[PDB]
Design a binder for these strands. Structure first.
Ligand SMILES: C#CCOc1ccc(C[C@H]2NC[C@H](O)[C@H]2OC(C)=O)cc1
Ligand SMILES: [K+]
Ligand SMILES: [K+]
Ligand SMILES: [K+]
Ligand SMILES: [K+]
Ligand SMILES: [K+]
Ligand SMILES: [K+]
Ligand SMILES: [K+]
Ligand SMILES: [K+]
Ligand SMILES: [Mg+2]
Ligand SMILES: [Mg+2]
Ligand SMILES: [Mg+2]
Ligand SMILES: [Mg+2]
Ligand SMILES: [Mg+2]
Ligand SMILES: [Mg+2]
Ligand SMILES: [Mg+2]
Ligand SMILES: [Mg+2]
Ligand SMILES: [Mg+2]
Ligand SMILES: [Mg+2]
Ligand SMILES: [Mg+2]
Ligand SMILES: [Mg+2]
Ligand SMILES: [Mg+2]
Ligand SMILES: [Mg+2]
Ligand SMILES: [Mg+2]
Ligand SMILES: [Mg+2]
Ligand SMILES: [Mg+2]
Ligand SMILES: [Mg+2]
Ligand SMILES: [Mg+2]
Ligand SMILES: [Mg+2]
Ligand SMILES: [Mg+2]
Ligand SMILES: [Mg+2]
Ligand SMILES: [Mg+2]
Ligand SMILES: [Mg+2]
Ligand SMILES: [Mg+2]
Ligand SMILES: [Mg+2]
Ligand SMILES: [Mg+2]
Ligand SMILES: [Mg+2]
Ligand SMILES: [Mg+2]
Ligand SMILES: [Mg+2]
Ligand SMILES: [Mg+2]
Ligand SMILES: [Mg+2]
Ligand SMILES: [Mg+2]
Ligand SMILES: [Mg+2]
Ligand SMILES: [Mg+2]
Ligand SMILES: [Mg+2]
Ligand SMILES: [Mg+2]
Ligand SMILES: [Mg+2]
Ligand SMILES: [Mg+2]
Ligand SMILES: [Mg+2]
Ligand SMILES: [Mg+2]
Ligand SMILES: [Mg+2]
Ligand SMILES: [Mg+2]
Ligand SMILES: [Mg+2]
Ligand SMILES: [Mg+2]
Ligand SMILES: [Mg+2]
Ligand SMILES: [Mg+2]
Ligand SMILES: [Mg+2]
Ligand SMILES: [Mg+2]
Ligand SMILES: [Mg+2]
Ligand SMILES: [Mg+2]
Ligand SMILES: [Mg+2]
Ligand SMILES: [Mg+2]
Ligand SMILES: [Mg+2]
Ligand SMILES: [Mg+2]
Ligand SMILES: [Mg+2]
Ligand SMILES: [Mg+2]
Ligand SMILES: [Mg+2]
Ligand SMILES: [Mg+2]
Ligand SMILES: [Mg+2]
Ligand SMILES: [Mg+2]
Ligand SMILES: [Mg+2]
Ligand SMILES: [Mg+2]
Ligand SMILES: [Mg+2]
Ligand SMILES: [Mg+2]
Ligand SMILES: [Mg+2]
Ligand SMILES: [Mg+2]
Ligand SMILES: [Mg+2]
Ligand SMILES: [Mg+2]
Ligand SMILES: [Mg+2]
Ligand SMILES: [Mg+2]
Ligand SMILES: [Mg+2]
Ligand SMILES: [Mg+2]
Ligand SMILES: [Mg+2]
Ligand SMILES: [Mg+2]
Ligand SMILES: [Mg+2]
Ligand SMILES: [Mg+2]
Ligand SMILES: [Mg+2]
Ligand SMILES: [Mg+2]
Ligand SMILES: [Mg+2]
Ligand SMILES: [Mg+2]
Ligand SMILES: [Mg+2]
Ligand SMILES: [Mg+2]
Ligand SMILES: [Mg+2]
Ligand SMILES: [Mg+2]
Ligand SMILES: [Mg+2]
Ligand SMILES: [Mg+2]
Ligand SMILES: [Mg+2]
Ligand SMILES: [Mg+2]
Ligand SMILES: [Mg+2]
Ligand SMILES: [Mg+2]
Ligand SMILES: [Mg+2]
Ligand SMILES: [Mg+2]
Ligand SMILES: [Mg+2]
Ligand code: NA
Ligand code: NA
Ligand code: NA
Ligand code: NA
Ligand code: NA
Ligand code: NA
Ligand code: NA
Ligand code: NA
Lengths: 221, 404
RNA sequence: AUCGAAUCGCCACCUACAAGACUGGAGCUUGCUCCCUCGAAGGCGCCAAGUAUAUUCAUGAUCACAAGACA
RNA sequence: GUGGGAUUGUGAAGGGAUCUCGCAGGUAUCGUGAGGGAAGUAUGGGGUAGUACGAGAGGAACUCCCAUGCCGUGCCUCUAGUUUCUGGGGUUUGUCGAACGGCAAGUGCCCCGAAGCCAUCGCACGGUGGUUCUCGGCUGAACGCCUCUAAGCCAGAAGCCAAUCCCAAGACCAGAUGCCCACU
RNA sequence: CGACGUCGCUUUUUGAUCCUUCGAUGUCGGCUCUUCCUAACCUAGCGCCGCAGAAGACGCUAAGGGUUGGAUUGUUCACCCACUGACAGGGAACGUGAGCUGGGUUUAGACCGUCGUGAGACAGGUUGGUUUUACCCUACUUAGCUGGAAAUUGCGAGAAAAAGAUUAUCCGUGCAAAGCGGACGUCGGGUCGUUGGGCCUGGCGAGCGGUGGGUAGUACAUGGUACGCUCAUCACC
RNA sequence: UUAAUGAGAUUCCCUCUGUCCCGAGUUACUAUCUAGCGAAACGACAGUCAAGGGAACGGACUUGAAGGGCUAAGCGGGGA
RNA sequence: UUAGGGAUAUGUGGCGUCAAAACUUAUGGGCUCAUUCUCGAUACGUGAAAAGGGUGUUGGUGGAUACAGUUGGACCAACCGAAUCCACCGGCCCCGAAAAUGGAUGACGCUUAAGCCCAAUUAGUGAUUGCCCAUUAUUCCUUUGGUAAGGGCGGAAACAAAUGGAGAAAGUGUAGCCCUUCCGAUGUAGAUGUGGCCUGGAGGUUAGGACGAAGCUUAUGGCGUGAGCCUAAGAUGGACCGGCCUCUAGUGCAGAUCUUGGUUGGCGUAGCAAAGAUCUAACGGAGAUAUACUCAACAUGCAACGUUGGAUACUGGAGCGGGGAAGGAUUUCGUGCCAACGGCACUCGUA
RNA sequence: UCGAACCACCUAGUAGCUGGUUCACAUCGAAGUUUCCCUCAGGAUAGCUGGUGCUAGUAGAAGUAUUGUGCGGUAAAGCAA
RNA sequence: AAGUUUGAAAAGCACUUUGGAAAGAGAGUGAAAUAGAACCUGAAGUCGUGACAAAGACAAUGGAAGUACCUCCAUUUCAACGGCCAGAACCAGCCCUACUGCAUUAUCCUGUCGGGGAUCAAAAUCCGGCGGGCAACGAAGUGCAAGAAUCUUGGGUCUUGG
């Protein structure tokens, strides 16, 4: 994680600038857990670097009690002779998603671990990801197109909090502060947004006339 | 087939692995729950175990057979020289646990605190904190300290102070260690701004045990037990001894597992390290918070026993020496041997019981010799029994005649 | 400083939020009518700093990892 | 680039080439806590009370208070056990001429015996919130009435989960710090 | 609770079979020790009763915890004495013999009864009758060293970080505001590339400081640090 | 039937005790570390588990769960 | 259902990921909600289930009533203004449904299914092959063998080098006389064939070797489907030996608790623990006081021997005392010596 | 060394039983059934298989139909035969 | 059990140096001491050393395809020359896709009359009578299709050979 002094020295000798790999950031809020994992697992195997946020807002079909009991049945499975080196049951919603993706990969091959190590999961949206670019969704894994709205569903964070996850309140407080800060920033920069809108509207009267007709033909004016 | 008769299993599976403790000092793994309505206060203190004795007091609890009657209670005496606050640390809450924000160091640190950073201090260059001292108090140094302090105000939910023991003030010949024991003490109570105010006011200052604990309160003890090295299953786990007829030995577990699973389970008693384990012990009632003998000599004097005695028994505490500092008298026993540094923590269990709420008044403190059936409480009592001895006559006769 | 590398979309307009049994706004008649920005585009970027009066490109010879890449 | 080595086996001393390796980290603290473990569990007495109930005979329980069994984690002030401190005394046979000092009897034997270790044979300590079962209910349709349910809610078990407690970063901590060095 | 019938479950009984093992998988019982199951004896709740109370019956959720000391018998079972809240039933190669023990069973010696002409026989009785080996690999218990995120390589660049001439071109304060408050100078040189240019360096000062000299009171647990004043030195520079 | 006799088999009583309740402490020689010396048994290949099927009880096979490497002292679950 | 390969199509089974295919297809219709072995997705495989039951939801059949049925109001009839209720039979779901290490639609997971029944192939548009996987099918190339099928084989004629070529065998089998064509090709026990391979000798024939035979060594390559053959190199060796035809036999090795020799992990491990015991100085000995720099000595030559003098202890006369028989036969004695041996050591010794 | 010692020999005793059995490729390729046997862990004997062929290469062909012409007493049915 | 099988000849390693010695380092003999005395040749197995290759834990080994690096190996080529690599052309043969005609509808298509239906009133769904008929837009998703990929320059063949 933390760069070595040799790595920093080599970069300065090369004189290169800041580098960021092409990373897709997925907002997992109101996404079906299984369908999102299957889509993400295939993309990881195709060499994509994927970061998922708001894992605590994933959805599973059924009542919360039914899915809580499902996790508790998974929790009771452990190597009796030595619970260490036994099955490791992770309670955080981001680790639950990571485990779901891992079971959908060839995890016991080097290629499978290369795909798995290309995925980063978070609860909420941490500051290092907030300003990296627009977030994406998976339309075929979204709740409002996947579930019939009459059926009950569970939120992953609510299920995880009652089976051992201890940071439900921390994530909620951090997410509240993030949205207020983003809303305040978005309440500002409105003048900049409207200034460019009027600049595009006023520019129609300054460009050559035949260029306006071309824009109208292709539905841009 | 099922076991013929049932009995509870030997030992507690929650104290595993039965390995040597990572550190020799007692460290609180958790602190009492913070409540913002109280004034800021420290929650722990480091002490040294001197020895044991017993006291006499009246019992106040109604409804008991010992109500308004005297009882004899063993107590443990722990030397508590004052602690020095050398730093402030702040923690912010993250989804993966607390993270340290930064450290604000005091402008001056004691020599015995800097000795902790060396394996051979006397033969070293002794350059610890030399650049920090030069950087601090400068224009950039003062700004950096202010920025770190402001970060604590904005992002910290937990404020702790860095404290260390004073082995120069302890003045113990058998303790050996000259480098201070360093620990973090959480500041509970008040707002985060109020916690930083107290921590700043305590920088470079001494803190006494009586400002952290009160006489009749209870406290938790974090300490490491006495080590015994490799021990067998009989002593390590309390299993039964096999009959005298047994071939290849008696002090063993006969069956260490069934055929299936084809493994030895983690629940089977095996020989290994015994002792030297960290233990957090609950509800140790403070029976006395004593003052230094240089300040108040009559440490063991009570309102009922008017004999002028110190807390140190006749002939000294065995293997430890004299208690020369402030001390804490805890009811009962604590884990670990003499000379070992221990942490007293403010209690985390509820303290609403009648036993925990009782006000303790000591009537008699035993100061007889811990070496071989002490029968005198003071040296004067021994002199009155024997009177002048042969060696007293020789010493007096030489002084009376040769020198006069 | 070995080191020649694979990678080929930038942004200080997306990089805030929430709901799909109804989120542009009204009316009463409650599914129709009316108003509007008319409800199906994140903005740029693709060879003249801008749609015109223009201007070096070769022989790197007909493909070859773009023989180059801080947009 | 620079530093350090080497090459394939019939000689020697010199020149090239070609390979391999080093070129930024060390050292000392304070913490985080994922995951794993996981523990406290029972009885009696006082009081309620000779009360509720009952014709009578009989005859209860919770709050609270005080003890105790088992289990667990320690501790050595007291009491007990243990002595190769062969500590100090006795005492038998042999033995150095005797006394002294002792010595041998694989610790001669006897009594007492500190320190240390140690015994429910002694002493101390053993805690908090949730999610739910079963079930009892609220609101309420389907089905004009009705209904704990079917959409919603409440209450809630020694179960279960977390706190407390134990190990803890191969959980690879871009957690925080002290000194050098390297880069600059 | 449930006759006459009828439908199941289980593998803690026996039987049926003969798939595995006969160049060998150590046989009963007990002792010890751990774990698992629930068809629940006690302990936590909750229904119902031919439920007044007390004591109980039946049933549901629940295996977290507990489930004893003895006489006879090799016994498993059985039975009796006694304590208790209760003294529930079972699995784990009929758990467990390189863990023990060896009383039984089942060699060779010997006695009795019955049978056999006999040698001998008897799921009839009786007494006496060698219990071997771990230093290997795993497992488990403790105990050391030690690299490693491309899980040893790639130079293959992702921070639960900041927030801007593209993180450069200062520090606070504030809401990623509106604003607001601060900042050591001066005189030269050298050396590279659009504005009071970057970097290196020298002389005068000043300021914040680190050490030591001389001095005064005070603090703190009282030998040992801090603090005022004043010199010297070093650093930012 | 039988006195005496018996390393013969059995039952009870007194005494006595670590046989037991219930374990604790100590000693010599080991084990343990070192110097010198220095084997054997055994050895297809090897050596983490769950379930599944399978010659009906897998270290290898299927699907999952684990597993950084090398080591010292033990230990008797497995290696049918 | 199987010679060695390629391409194109399929079979069974599939198309959410693992895992190729609907990057979760349709502009197809319905049904299902299942709280601790955890709804279902199991042909064979019963390789998990019954009788019985459900006012769960969705369908049917046959009857009954319609100013109805339920309420409110006075055991019956009136207000009140809509469709009800009676029996029976299906579908899916649920209960019945309890076992021992933690675990299994294969795992994750799935509920606008990724479940069940049915039905399609880019969809009321305009016609009858969605897609993915074989040692199968079709087809192309090569091999090999046939109950194989045919052609050619009387050199057509012409043609030096320096500057079109080569071959053409009347043939079972070879480097196959050459060319064309068709079909088959797996296989335990077992049979047979092979101008099939290899080894020691013999009769022949033809060669090689001191300018290096046999043997041996190999990241030495080439040839053969193979058994194997051949070349290269030896910074290997030092005297014999290859090819071909025929003859001949003690003629080919991975295993027989195989035989003999050697080696080997275990392993510097188990251990070398009954008979109480040695200490000290000096002498002897190569066995030491054994040293780059720095450096007064310790922290850099350790540990071990024999003799003598002291010390301490043991045997304790049924003795590690002094003599004999049996047995042994030079072990006796002196000097010298330390390779092996005296399971450690020796400067000592029954060597 | 004893419910018949030891040494050499007959003796390489016999064994329907256990174990082993050394090169390649090619063309073909089974049976665990019949009868007899002191036969039931084994043999003979037919069958299945290989090799060698012989005979005028469609001949005396067929695990299949059709059409004629025979045979039958199981499924079903019946007990009012 | 054991070939004394060193070498043609003992010419069997004088002498120097370290070491108590055994021996080592040199120097000599010899064609050859790696021919140094149980001495020709000197295999396998096992082990040491230097160099290099890397490598988690999938016991290791193995199969098939590639790749990175090495190669004391073989062969070929080195002028308008190549037996090397690659791309486009054309041919022949295959394998694919595009472009469609014949037949058939009637339980059907229309108009009109009557009924019936539901509406504020209609219409329509529906049933009869009669009269016409080709539902003909890419009519139908109904039976069969033979349409020279030359016309009218489709695609592939690193799945063939030129
Ligand atoms: C008498 C009698 C009955 O009880 C037994 C007990 C043990 C055995 C031995 C067999 N057990 C499995 C294997 O077949 C054999 O293992 C071995 C070591 O031979 C047989 C019968
Ligand atoms: K936990
Ligand atoms: K647990
Ligand atoms: K780490
Ligand atoms: K057997
Ligand atoms: K109960
Ligand atoms: K008998
Ligand atoms: K051939
Ligand atoms: K051998
Ligand atoms: Mg929706
Ligand atoms: Mg039991
Ligand atoms: Mg038992
Ligand atoms: Mg048992
Ligand atoms: Mg015994
Ligand atoms: Mg024994
Ligand atoms: Mg004492
Ligand atoms: Mg003596
Ligand atoms: Mg005593
Ligand atoms: Mg049975
Ligand atoms: Mg059997
Ligand atoms: Mg055995
Ligand atoms: Mg066997
Ligand atoms: Mg066994
Ligand atoms: Mg139950
Ligand atoms: Mg229970
Ligand atoms: Mg239990
Ligand atoms: Mg058994
Ligand atoms: Mg059983
Ligand atoms: Mg045994
Ligand atoms: Mg046994
Ligand atoms: Mg056993
Ligand atoms: Mg017996
Ligand atoms: Mg008779
Ligand atoms: Mg017997
Ligand atoms: Mg007998
Ligand atoms: Mg006997
Ligand atoms: Mg790396
Ligand atoms: Mg297993
Ligand atoms: Mg074992
Ligand atoms: Mg053992
Ligand atoms: Mg083919
Ligand atoms: Mg294909
Ligand atoms: Mg796929
Ligand atoms: Mg779909
Ligand atoms: Mg099935
Ligand atoms: Mg299956
Ligand atoms: Mg079935
Ligand atoms: Mg049914
Ligand atoms: Mg129903
Ligand atoms: Mg139904
Ligand atoms: Mg129904
Ligand atoms: Mg499952
Ligand atoms: Mg299922
Ligand atoms: Mg499946
Ligand atoms: Mg062919
Ligand atoms: Mg001619
Ligand atoms: Mg021929
Ligand atoms: Mg064949
Ligand atoms: Mg021969
Ligand atoms: Mg010849
Ligand atoms: Mg080689
Ligand atoms: Mg090799
Ligand atoms: Mg030959
Ligand atoms: Mg032979
Ligand atoms: Mg061989
Ligand atoms: Mg063998
Ligand atoms: Mg070895
Ligand atoms: Mg040893
Ligand atoms: Mg021994
Ligand atoms: Mg001895
Ligand atoms: Mg001597
Ligand atoms: Mg020395
Ligand atoms: Mg010496
Ligand atoms: Mg003696
Ligand atoms: Mg004696
Ligand atoms: Mg005598
Ligand atoms: Mg004698
Ligand atoms: Mg002699
Ligand atoms: Mg020796
Ligand atoms: Mg004998
Ligand atoms: Mg036979
Ligand atoms: Mg055989
Ligand atoms: Mg065949
Ligand atoms: Mg038979
Ligand atoms: Mg046979
Ligand atoms: Mg047989
Ligand atoms: Mg019949
Ligand atoms: Mg009939
Ligand atoms: Mg009849
Ligand atoms: Mg010469
Ligand atoms: Mg040689
Ligand atoms: Mg030679
Ligand atoms: Mg030789
Ligand atoms: Mg060799
Ligand atoms: Mg080697
Ligand atoms: Mg493998
Ligand atoms: Mg390769
Ligand atoms: Mg009409
Ligand atoms: Mg007509
Ligand atoms: Mg169509
Ligand atoms: Mg055409
Ligand atoms: Mg073509
Ligand atoms: Mg071609
Ligand atoms: Na005592
Ligand atoms: Na006798
Ligand atoms: Na095995
Ligand atoms: Na596996
Ligand atoms: Na559907
Ligand atoms: Na042929
Ligand atoms: Na020893
Ligand atoms: Na009409």
């Amino acid at each position: 994680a933390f760069p070595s002094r040799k790595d920093a020295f080599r970069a300065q000798r090369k004189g290169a600038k800041k580098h960021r790999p092409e990373i897709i950031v997925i907002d997992l809020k109101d996404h079906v857990l299984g369908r999102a994992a299957a889509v993400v697992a295939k993309q990881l195997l195709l060499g994509k670097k994927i970061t998922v946020v708001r894992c605590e807002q994933l959805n599973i079909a059924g009542t919360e009690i039914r899915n809580k009991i499902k996790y508790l049945q998974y929790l009771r499975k452990r190597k009796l002779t030595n619970p260490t080196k036994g099955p490791f049951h992770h309670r955080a919603p981001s680790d639950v998603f990571v485990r779901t993706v891992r079971s959908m990969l060839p995890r016991y091959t080097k290629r499978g671990m290369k795909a798995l190590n290309s995925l980063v999961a978070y609860e909420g949206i941490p500051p290092n990801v907030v300003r990296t670019g627009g977030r994406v969704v998976i339309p075929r894994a979204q709740r409002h197109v996947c579930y019939r709205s009459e059926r009950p569903y569970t939120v992953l964070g609510n299920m995880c909090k009652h089976v051992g996850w201890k940071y439900s309140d921390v994530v909620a407080n951090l997410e509240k502060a993030r949205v207020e800060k983003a809303s305040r920033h978005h309440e500002k920069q409105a003048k900049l947004r409207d200034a460019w809108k009027s600049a595009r509207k006023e520019a129609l009267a300054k460009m050559p006339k035949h260029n306006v007709e071309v824009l109208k033909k292709f539905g841009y004016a | 087939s099922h076991c013929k008769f049932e009995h509870p299993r030997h030992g507690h599976l929650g104290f595993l692995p039965r390995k040597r403790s990572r550190q020799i000092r007692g460290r609180a793994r958790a602190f009492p729950k913070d409540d913002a309505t109280q004034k800021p206060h420290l929650t722990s203190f480091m002490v040294f175990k001197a020895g044991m004795t017993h006291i006499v007091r009246d019992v106040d609890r109604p409804g008991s057979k010992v109500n308004k009657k005297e009882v004899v209670e063993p107590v443990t005496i722990l030397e508590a020289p004052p602690m020095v606050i050398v730093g402030i640390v702040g923690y912010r809450q993250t989804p993966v646990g607390l993270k340290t924000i930064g450290t604000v160091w005091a402008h001056h640190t004691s020599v015995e605190f800097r000795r902790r950073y060396y394996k051979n201090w006397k033969q070293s260059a002794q350059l610890a904190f030399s650049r920090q001292k030069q950087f601090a108090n400068t224009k950039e140094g003062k700004v950096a300290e202010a920025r770190t302090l402001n970060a604590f105000a904005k992002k910290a939910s937990v404020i702790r102070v860095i404290a260390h023991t004073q082995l120069r003030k302890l003045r113990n010949h058998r303790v050996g260690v000259k480098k201070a024991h360093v620990q973090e003490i959480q500041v509970n109570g008040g707002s985060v701004a109020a916690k930083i105010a107290l921590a700043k006011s305590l920088l470079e200052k001494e803190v006494r045990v009586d400002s952290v604990f009160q006489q009749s309160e209870a406290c938790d003890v974090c300490s490491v037990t006495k080590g015994h090295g490799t021990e067998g299953v009989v002593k390590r786990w309390g299993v039964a001894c096999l009959p005298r007829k047994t071939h290849r030995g008696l002090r063993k577990v006969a069956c260490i597992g069934a055929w299936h699973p084809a493994r030895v389970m983690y629940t089977v008693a095996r020989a290994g390290q015994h002792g030297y384990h960290h233990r957090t012990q609950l509800n140790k009632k403070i029976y006395q918070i004593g003052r230094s003998v240089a300040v108040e000599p009559n440490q063991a004097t009570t309102t009922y026993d008017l004999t002028a005695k110190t807390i140190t028994p006749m002939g000294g505490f065995v293997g430890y020496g004299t208690v020369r500092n402030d001390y804490v008298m805890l009811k009962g026993s604590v884990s670990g041997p003499r000379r070992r540094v221990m942490t007293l923590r403010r209690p985390m269990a509820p303290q609403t019981s009648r036993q925990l709420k009782e006000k303790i008044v000591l009537k008699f403190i035993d100061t007889s010799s811990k070496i071989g059936h002490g029968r005198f409480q003071t040296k004067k009592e021994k002199n009155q029994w024997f009177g002048p001895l042969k060696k007293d006559r020789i010493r007096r006769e030489e002084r009376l005649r040769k020198e006069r």
